[PDB]
Design a protein around this nucleic acid. Structure first.
Lengths: 271, 48
RNA sequence: UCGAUGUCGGCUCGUCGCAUCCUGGGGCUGAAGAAGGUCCCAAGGGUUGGGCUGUUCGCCCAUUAAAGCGGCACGCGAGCU
RNA sequence: CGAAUGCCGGCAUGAGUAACGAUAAAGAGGGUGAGAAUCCCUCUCGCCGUAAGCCCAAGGGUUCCUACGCAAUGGUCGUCAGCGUAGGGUUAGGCGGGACCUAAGGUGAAGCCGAAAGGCGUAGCCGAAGGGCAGCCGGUUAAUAUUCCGGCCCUUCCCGCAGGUGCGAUGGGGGGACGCUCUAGGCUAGGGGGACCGGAGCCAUGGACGAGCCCGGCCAGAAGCGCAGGGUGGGAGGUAGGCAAAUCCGCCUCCCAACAAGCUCUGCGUGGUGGGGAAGCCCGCAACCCCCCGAAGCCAGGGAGCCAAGAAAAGCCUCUAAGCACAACCUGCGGGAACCCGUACCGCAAACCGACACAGGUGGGCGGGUGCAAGAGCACUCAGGCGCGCGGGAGAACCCUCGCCAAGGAACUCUGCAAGUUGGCCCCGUAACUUCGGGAGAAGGGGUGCUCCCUGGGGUGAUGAGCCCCGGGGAGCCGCAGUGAACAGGCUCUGGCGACUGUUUACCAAAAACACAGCUCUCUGCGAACUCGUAAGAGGAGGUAUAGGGAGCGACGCUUGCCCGGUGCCGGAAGGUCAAGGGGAGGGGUGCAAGCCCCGAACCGAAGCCCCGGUGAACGGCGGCCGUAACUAUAACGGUCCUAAGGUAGCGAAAUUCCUUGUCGGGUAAGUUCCGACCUGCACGAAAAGCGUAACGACCGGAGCGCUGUCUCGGCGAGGGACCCGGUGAAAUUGAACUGGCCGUGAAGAUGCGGCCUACCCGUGGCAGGACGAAAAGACCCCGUGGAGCUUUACUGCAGC
RNA sequence: CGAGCUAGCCCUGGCCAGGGUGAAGCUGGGGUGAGACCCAGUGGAGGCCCGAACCGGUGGGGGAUGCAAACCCCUCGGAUG
RNA sequence: GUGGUUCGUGGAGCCAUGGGGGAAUCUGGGCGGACCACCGCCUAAGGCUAAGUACUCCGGGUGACCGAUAGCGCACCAGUA
RNA sequence: AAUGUAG
RNA sequence: CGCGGGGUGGAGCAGCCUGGUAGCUCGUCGGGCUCAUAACCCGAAGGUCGUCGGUUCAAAUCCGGCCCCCGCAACCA
RNA sequence: AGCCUACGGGCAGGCGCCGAGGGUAGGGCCCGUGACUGGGGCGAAGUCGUAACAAGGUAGCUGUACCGGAAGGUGCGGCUGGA
RNA sequence: GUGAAAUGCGCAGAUACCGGGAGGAACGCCGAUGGCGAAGGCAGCCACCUGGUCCACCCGUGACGCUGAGGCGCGAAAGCGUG
C-alpha cells in the first residue's frame, strides 16, 4: 500500500514506507529455527572487495527452507506471516503436522491458517511445492531450483515469478523474471504462485540516511576522483569522461558483455 | 591535542612481543639480529 | 643582483624638480570696460569632500582661487594593508 | 689546511638585554634558621564551586609516610619539595581479573593450496569493558582497608547424618536472550521547610530575651511481617519432528482453570542488633521526630507506538544414553576445606600523551544552596580546594585587553572588516510567495519591580488544617531605569550557485567542491557478473533480476531536438586475410647401396582485423557566400557551395561577451558594481543535463532602515606590558672594524676610492630611511642527454582476457 | 618495521541539561445513501526548531626565538543522528 | 618451450628439462659442434668415497699497524646512556 | 499541375 | 606585426598537387506553351582567371612583388 | 498653598478618562505612468505561398496532441453543415 | 511497393508452402434504415454481482406531484502521474 508522509520536514516529504498489513500479528522472530547471528562484514581476508558497503541496523538472520522435498507429503498450516530484514520478500512461519517448523519465502495470496504441502501429489495451489514436470504448463511459480536437489535459486525477490512455458524430455522450458528462456530439469522443485510483497519496488527511500540504515555507504563518482584513482579521474574543472565509460578497473561499462563465452550453462539458456 | 603516543600495554605486548616476533619468520630474524648485536633487550619490555 | 634586490594599488609619512593648476609681478593682444587668449618672471604658500572600479588613470556629483605634472627602487610591507 | 652554509670540541658577540609560562590578588603578626617576600602557624583579603571539589578506569611505577639533607633540579629565593640519604608502608572465598562462558578476530585436529618461507580452514582452543557470580555499615594507621578489627550476612567445594527420587551427559529440549522513541504507578537516592526535639554560647552600635541568632536533628541491618511490582496456566490421551534413544520440547484432540487466585522472584519499608552524632571556650553537652519537593536510579524481562526489525555461549532448568540402582542425584543440618594475581600514591594532572613543574589533549560516576520561566545555562555561594615557584617601584611614548565621548552618522573601506544596535519571558500583531509543511522569533508593538485588598483551580493530606503548584481581578508606592547585576537574536528588499540535514583540504581553501534521496544507460541466469588472491580460498550472499556490479546526471516542476561517416559497444553459421598444426607437388646434402638427414608449392587450418548492419541519458558533432518587400531599413522569400548532419525548446554583455564602463530603463546629488530589458551568443544550450523553483546556507553580489570611534578627528580614562630597582638570564646573527653628508666614481644603487662639507669622548629611552639588513644554496625563469607523478591512437613489453 | 596518529570496516559498551514545534493515528462531533472531508480533544512524529554537555572550526583580534612544531580570546556551525 | 657453456637463433652441436610422441640390451646405445659417410672415443637413465680447497666465533705468534677527534661503535660497566 | 492591381 | 586560406562569365563553385582543353547549377537574352504570368520546352550570349613582373616554346596552372577578403596565434612572468 | 463665604459650600488651581490630530510600523483596493514586450484594429494598387468556397484538385469542419516560414500538415476520435 | 518508380528486404538463402511455439490487440458471418442506455456511450462465448425498462392482474398507499438557482455525480477522443 505504501505509506506516504506529510511534509513536516523536507526529505520526509519524498519518503514512503511499507504497509505492514502483509505480516501483522507476528514480529519477534522464531527463537528456535530462525536465528543464527548474522555476520556483518563488507569484505574477505583484509581488503574491501565490495565498495560502499557498511553501517546499517544490526541484524539477525532467519534460516529459511529452500529445499522443500525433505517434507514430501507432510502438510503444514501457515501459522504467521512475519518481517524479514534479510531479503525483500516477507516470510511465513509454518508449523508442520510433523511438529517441526520452518520459514518459507512467503508467496503472494498465502494467508494465516492455510495448509500447504509439497510433493508430486500436491494440489496445484498457492505455496505448495512440486517437481516442475507435475506443474501445469502456464502456471506462474517461484523459488525454483535450477538443478535437482540443489536448492531454490530463482524467483525470490519481492514480487517475482517464473512461468512454465513448455515441456521437453527430462527438461522443461521456463521464462525467468529477467525475460530469459531457460530449460530446467523436471525434478527441480518449485513452489506454485509468485512471491508477493510486490509493492517493495515502490518504497521511496526518502533521504540519504536510511540508505545508511540499510548499510549502503556513499558512492563517489569516477570523474570526481583523480587519475591515480580512476579512469575518468582528472580534468581541469569538470569533464566529459573522454571516451568510453569505464569502471575504476578500466574495463568498459557501457554495453560490454561480460558472461563467459564457452560456459556449459549455454545450450540451456535461450534469451 | 592527541599525539602519536598513547601507551597501552596489551597493544604493546601483542605487537612487539617476544611471542609476536617469534611467530613470523620476519620477526624471528629481528630477534636473531638483536641477539647478534648484543642488545640487552630483544623485546620492548612491558609490565604493571 | 637567482647560497633571494618582496614584484600593483591603498594608507601613513614626507622631500625634491619646474616643463606653474591657483595665488604675486609683467609684455603682446583680433586688449573699449568686465572677462579671456598668449607668452615672459616666479614654487613662498596652497592645490577640497564624495559616487564607480583592487585599480593607476579616468568619467561623474557638489564645490573651489586652484582642483598642476613629475622624481625619490612605477619613494615608503625589518611602518600597516 | 684558512676557507668545503666542512667534521668534533671549547670559548666569544647580541647582553646584563628579551624573558621568568595565564591580569584568581594580596596584606600583616608571630615561629624557625647562618640566611626567609618565597617554609610553619594565626588573622585579614581575593579565586574555583556541572570545579580549579570528591571517586573510578587507563597510563605512570615508589612519586606514598616519617626522619635527616640543600651541591644540583625548581624559570627567583628555599630552611620547602614530587629533589638527595635512610627507614617504613600496599593484608581479600564475597572488590577486580585468573583455576566459568562465549563476540569480532586469532589460532587451528581433519581437510585444501602454495618453488621454499608460507596461505587458507571444520570441530576444538585462545580471545571482554559483553554474560555468569557470594558484602554491607562502622572503627582503626604516620602511611592499607568492602582486604585489619567489630557487628550483622552470604557462596562454593569435601566429608558425615537424616529425609526425599529412577539416578544418570561431552547428547536432546527450554532458558540465558537483547532494537529505538514515548511513557504508568509505586518506591529510594537526593533536596527544602518546621513555631517541634537536642545543644555550647550570643543580645553588639539606635532597636530586639524574641515563633530571636547560630549548630544539628542520621546510617547499616538477616528471618518474618507489610507495601509495590516482575514472572508463570493446570490436565488426560495420540504423536510422521527436535538426525526417534526421551515421561522433555514441538505439533494435533478435550474436562477444568482464567483481563484472578495461587506458586514463584525482585525492589522499598519495618525490623533483633550494631554504629554515628554539630556549632562552642583551654581540643568534648549526647536529639535522632513532623511536613514538602523528588529522580534520567530501583521494582525491570513493566507498558504503548514505530521500522531500519535489533549478539553469542556457559552457569541454570528439564529430557532421556550407555551405565548404575549396597550406586547416584535432590533437600535439609552439622563439621571440615577455600589457591594465584592486583590492592601505596598521581589520576583533567607538576606524577598520563605532548623534549619543560608546557595556557594544548585524556574515557566513566558524584557534583549541595538561592535567584533569574526552565536547565548540567548565568551570578553569588556550602563542603572541599586554590592566589597559578621571581619580586619591589614608577605612572612616558608605544602595544594588548577594556570603558566612555559633543555634533555628524558608513562620509571609513576592496568590504560596516570590527564594534555597536537587538536581546529573556508574557500578550497583541504579522506581507509577497508557497511543494501547501512553511515563509515566522517575519516585521511591528505593548508589558515586566514592590505594597495592600478580593478571588479561581491542582497536588499532598482526608474532602478541613497547613506544605507545595498553576492562575484571575482591584486599588496603591519608588527611582533616570523593574529580564534594574549576569547569561540574552539587529531587521528588510533584491540577485548568483547548490534542492535539502551532511562531507572535505589534520596544520593557509568548508565552497558553487564531495555526498545525497531520485532519473537513465549498461552488465550479471547463479560455480552470477565484478573484486582480492600464484593457488586453495573469501567477499558478492548464506543474496538470486522488485536482486547484485559498473557508469553518468543529482529533491521537485516543465523539458531533453537533428547527425551512426569516424571511434567504442551489440548483432551478422557468407566472403577476404589469418598462426601453430595437417598436407606433401617439387628441390637438395650424403652414402656402393639399403637408407639417414635437410628444405618445401597446392590445398584443409581459430580468434582477431577487413566487410554488412544496429547503436546518442555511447567518445563526440550540430556550417558558408550571394540576392530579394511600392521611402529607407531589414529580410517572411529565393540561389548556390560544403557536411555525417548543420543548434530545436529554453536561456543570453551571463561564475560564459573580446570589443565593454555595449545600449536603453531602474536605483543615487554622482553607480566600471547591482537590478530589469534589448541579442551580432569573440566563445550558452538540453542528463560533464536545459530553463525554473518554495524552503534551506558560518556560501558570493546589490540596496535600504536601525546603530555605531569605521570615519570627519581625535580626546580622556582602567588594567597587563614597555621604563627604574633587586634575583636568574637566552636567541638568531657575527671576515675583521677606528662603521658621517653631498656630488662624483666604481661590476654601472659606496662608511671603506676622488673632491668638497661636516663631526669633542661614552651612554639611555624612542623610529624604522640605509647597511642591496636576517632567515631559506629562488617556488618564477632557463639549463641537466637530472628525477618523479599523471596521459595517450608515443615505443616495447607484462597481468588479464 | 609500522593502523598505541590518522582513514574505513567489524565485536561489545557508554553519552546527548532543559526549553519549543505538534505529523500520523486514535476519540468525539458534524457530514453523506454510504463516503470523501471538516471540526475540536487527545496523542507525541522528525537526517524538526532554540540551546548546555559533547562534536566542531565560520569571521575578527592576539600570538609568531609562542603557553603551543596550529595555542589563547571574542564570534560562529551541529547538537536523536 | 627454455636454462647452462665463450655461444645474444647463429651453420648451433653438447649438458639439463616443463609439454607431446616414444625404443633397443652389444647388429645394443651416447659422443667427437647442423647433417651424411668412413675412422675413432665412451658405456646413460642407482648410490658412496678421504686428501690436496674455503672461512676465522675461538687459542697463539708476528708487525717500516693505531696510540684515546687514532685504533673496533666500545682502552673507561657500550651495543650502554 | 500555382497565380490574375483599386475602384 | 606572428603563422594559413581564398581571389575564375551577373551569383555560388570546379579546373591549379599532375602547364597546352576554362566545366557545373542558378541567373540573362531570343523563340515556344498560356487570354496573361509563373512552372515546363527550344536555342544562344557572356570570363581581362584581383594585379605587375619572372620561367617556359607555351602560364588560370610553375615562380616570385604589391592590392584586397576571411581564419587561427599572441603563452611563463 | 491661594480668592470668596450667608463656614455648609463656591471659585481658582491640580490629577484622571476620552479626544481633533500628529507620529511610528504593517497591510488592502483604485488611478496615472515605465526601458522593453504580446498580440488586436485600420490603412486605392508591397513579399511569399494557395489553406477554404466547385470531389476547391488530400471531402470539410471539429475537441485534442505533436510538428512546421505562413496559410497549415499529421495522428486519435467525433459531426454531416459531405458523399 | 506505385500512377510509374525508388527507398527498403533477399544467394549471409528472402518471397511463396508445410509443421511446432510465443505474444498482444480486435471480435468475421449473425448484423439490420435492429436493440439497450440520462448522456458520453455499449458487440466472440461462459458464469456471478447489479441498474434501468415494458406488459398483464386492478390487489395496496391516497396528491405522497412537476420542475430545479447553487451542490453533487457521470462525462468520447486526445493529454497527464505511478507501474
Amino acid at each position: 500500500a505504501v505509506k506516504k508522509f506529510k511534509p513536516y520536514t523536507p526529505s520526509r516529504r519524498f519518503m514512503t514506507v511499507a504497509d505492514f498489513s502483509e505480516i501483522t500479528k507476528t514480529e519477534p522472530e522464531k527463537s528456535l529455527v530462525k536465528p543464527l547471528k548474522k555476520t556483518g562484514g563488507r569484505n574477505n581476508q583484509g581488503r574491501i572487495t565490495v565498495r560502499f558497503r557498511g553501517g546499517g541496523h544490526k541484524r539477525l538472520y532467519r534460516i529459511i527452507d529452500f529445499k522443500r522435498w525433505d517434507k514430501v507429503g507432510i502438510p503444514a498450516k501457515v501459522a504467521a506471516i512475519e518481517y524479514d530484514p534479510n531479503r525483500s520478500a516477507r516470510i511465513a512461519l509454518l508449523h508442520y503436522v510433523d511438529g517441526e517448523k520452518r520459514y518459507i519465502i512467503a508467496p503472494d495470496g498465502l494467508q494465516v491458517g492455510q495448509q500447504v504441502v509439497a510433493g508430486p501429489d500436491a494440489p496445484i495451489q498457492v505455496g505448495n511445492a512440486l517437481p516442475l514436470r507435475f506443474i501445469p504448463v502456464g502456471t506462474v511459480v517461484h523459488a525454483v531450483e535450477l538443478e535437482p536437489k540443489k536448492g531454490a535459486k530463482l524467483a525470490r525477490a519481492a514480487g517475482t515469478s517464473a512461468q512454465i512455458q513448455g515441456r521437453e524430455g527430462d527438461y522443461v522450458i521456463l521464462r525467468l523474471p529477467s525475460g530469459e528462456l531457460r530449460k530446467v530439469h523436471g525434478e527441480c522443485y518449485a513452489t506454485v504462485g509468485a512471491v508477493g510483497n510486490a509493492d517493495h519496488k515502490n518504497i521511496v527511500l526518502g533521504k540519504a540516511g536510511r540508505s545508511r540504515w540499510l548499510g549502503r555507504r556513499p558512492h563517489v563518482r569516477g570523474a570526481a576522483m583523480n587519475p591515480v584513482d580512476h579512469p575518468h579521474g582528472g580534468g581541469e574543472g569538470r569533464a566529459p569522461r573522454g571516451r568510453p565509460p569505464a569502471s575504476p578497473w578500466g574495463w568498459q561499462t557501457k554495453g560490454l558483455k561480460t558472461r563467459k563465452r564457452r560456459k556449459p550453462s549455454s545450450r540451456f539458456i535461450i534469451a | 591535542m592527541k599525539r602519536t603516543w598513547q601507551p597501552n600495554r596489551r597493544k604493546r605486548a601483542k605487537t612487539h612481543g617476544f611471542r609476536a616476533r617469534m611467530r613470523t619468520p620476519g620477526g624471528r630474524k629481528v630477534l636473531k639480529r638483536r641477539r647478534q648485536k648484543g642488545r640487552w633487550r630483544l623485546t620492548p619490555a612491558v609490565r604493571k
